Amino acid sequence: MKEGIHPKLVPARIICGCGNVIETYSTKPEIYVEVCSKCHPFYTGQQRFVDTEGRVERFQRRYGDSYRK
């Protein structure tokens, strides 16, 4: 590589919020991120962050069967 134009790559820590730490390389030796592949809901299986809903409507109402048959 040409000299004096490229940011030097050094060994680097990456600390995600989920405690996962990656041993990679970067121009910054230590970086904090809010998410990573180890915890992101698309990555960690069908980790439905909230809406493990199912249908949900238009029948799980069932309030109720009091009308006659």
Partner 1 sequence: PLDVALKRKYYEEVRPELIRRFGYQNVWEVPRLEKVVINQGLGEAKEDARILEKAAQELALITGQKPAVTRAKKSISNFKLRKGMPIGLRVTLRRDRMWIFLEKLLNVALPRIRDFRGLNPNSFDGRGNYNLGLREQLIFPEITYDMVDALRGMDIAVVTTAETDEEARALLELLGFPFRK
Partner 2 sequence: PRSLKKGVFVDDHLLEKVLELNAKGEKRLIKTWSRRSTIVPEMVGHTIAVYNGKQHVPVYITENMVGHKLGEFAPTRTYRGHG
Partner 3 sequence: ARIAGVEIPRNKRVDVALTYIYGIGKARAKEALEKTGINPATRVKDLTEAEVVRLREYVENTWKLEGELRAEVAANIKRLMDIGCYRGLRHRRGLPVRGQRTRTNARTRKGPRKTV
Show binding-site residues: 16, 18, 36, 39
**28 in Cβ contact with 8 (< 8 Å):** no
Q: Does 45 bind partner 2 (CB under 8 A)?
A: no
| The entry of partner 2, Zn ion, partner 1, none that residue 18 binds, CB within 5 to 8 Å by partner kind | Zn ion
Least Å distance between CB 69 and partner 2?
Answer: 5
Q: Which of 2, 6, 48, 69 binds partner 2 (CB under 8 A)?
A: 69
Q: Which of 40, 47, 56, 60 binds partner 1 (CB under 8 A)?
A: 40
Look at phi and psi of residue 13 and say left if phi exceeds 0, alpha if psi is from -120 to 50, else beta. beta
| Residue spans of beta strands (DSSP E) within the chain | 10-16, 21-26, 30-33
